[PDB]
Ligand binder design. Sequence first.
Ligand SMILES: CC1(C)C=Cc2c(ccc3c2OC[C@@H](c2ccc(O)cc2O)C3)O1
Ligand SMILES: CC1(C)C=Cc2c(ccc3c2OC[C@@H](c2ccc(O)cc2O)C3)O1
Ligand SMILES: [Ca+2]
Ligand SMILES: [Ca+2]
Lengths: 115, 115, 115, 115
Amino acid sequence: CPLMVKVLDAVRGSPAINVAVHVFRKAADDTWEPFASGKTSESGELHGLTTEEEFVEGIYKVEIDTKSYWKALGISPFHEHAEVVFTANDSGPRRYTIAALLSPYSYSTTAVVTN
Amino acid sequence: CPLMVKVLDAVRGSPAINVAVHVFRKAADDTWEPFASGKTSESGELHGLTTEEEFVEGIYKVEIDTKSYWKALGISPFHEHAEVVFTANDSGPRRYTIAALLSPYSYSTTAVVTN
Amino acid sequence: CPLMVKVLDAVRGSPAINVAVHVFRKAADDTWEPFASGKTSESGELHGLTTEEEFVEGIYKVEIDTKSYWKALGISPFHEHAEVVFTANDSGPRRYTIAALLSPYSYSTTAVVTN
Amino acid sequence: CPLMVKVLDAVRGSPAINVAVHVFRKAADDTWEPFASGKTSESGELHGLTTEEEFVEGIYKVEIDTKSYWKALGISPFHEHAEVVFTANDSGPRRYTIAALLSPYSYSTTAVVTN
Ligand SMILES: CC1(C)C=Cc2c(ccc3c2OC[C@@H](c2ccc(O)cc2O)C3)O1
Ligand SMILES: CC1(C)C=Cc2c(ccc3c2OC[C@@H](c2ccc(O)cc2O)C3)O1
Ligand SMILES: [Ca+2]
Ligand SMILES: [Ca+2]
């Protein structure tokens, strides 16, 4: 897994389960082309989005559907989604972990980049 | 001032100064029409982006140029920027404060919505 | 006002109001001598905790009663409180702002230190 | 592992390695008695602090030595440490994951509590 997404719920103190995640890659014509998508598991993790071969150099956008997550719990949140945009693999292949913590009116995201 | 942005620097424990902030409104064609912009003051605040007349219900995007900020400090950042996307006033005009805390590999944002 | 505390609520997207805040100074016996205290205002701010004369170099603890806050909202919290421990002015009087964002199972804090 | 601690570095986008962690438990005479201690591994994780049998009901304090971590990287941080105080196992045995994200002038902590 060159790209992994982990999402936590700050209100329930739990993994954020069944959270839709969409990954895009900036095309040559500056458009966002769909790259991969999935949903977080029971552990709040999303594995197997892509492969080392497919995950080339580029600018990527990870869009976490936080709104749908909070709605399903009967909460009307502030954000439409949580976005993470980053240039990947510019100095060679790396392993990326995108961690997100969710509150109805707040979110934080951090990146763990290893070799 | 129905919309305010405040940005902090978690590395130097200071306001994030001279940070470019762009605000967009979602058009009917579902693209982002530029709406307002500016740069954070010495207190890391950005006021007078819009007015009560102009700030109608809709979906707004607040884009914070975090990458330029870190580049100017000589610090390698992860994110291209920080986006904050929300539906405004979906029950009528309140005051919006978008607060952001910046680190090279992490950002957190929260909304303070008041009467 | 050399020391200010501001508390936000990530669940309701509002200032955290009427939150008890206690400040301690580390004594020579290395216990915490009470120093100042108060409750956050309607803007979630707490001013006039101390003065420039009283606020000398040393190790200070800012204890935020987050548990009482969540109990009053009818929300089950994880933390007993939020402590912020720091060495003050270790190169001479600057102004300190302790910002805290509260969620039932999470809290974040940052310091804004200025001239 | 009924109690696990995971620590990340928001400046380097990496696990926080070799971070000292001290766990205390509130005694009957209201004193903090030493419970367990350890250091985070290469993955920024601390496992095997305690056992299901030893981890009884009580109020616990997890103290993360963030100051020493930043010093070793040539940084003079704001906080002396990052503290997490919580009542554990009040409605029966639970599994606790304490996650912490570190910046020189900021930290956030969240709890993941499962069965
Ligand atoms: C930024 C903040 C507030 C603090 C750290 C954090 C987070 C959300 C999710 C995760 C965080 O760190 C631990 C991380 C994690 C958990 C289990 C695991 O096996 C690997 C991991 O990288 C998940 O939010
Ligand atoms: C750390 C995090 C997640 C993000 C920023 C933040 C916060 C909690 C409280 C405050 C934050 O930044 C803005 C700050 C603030 C607000 C109004 C003001 O007039 C001055 C300020 O310094 C208060 O949580
Ligand atoms: Ca390259
Ligand atoms: Ca009990």
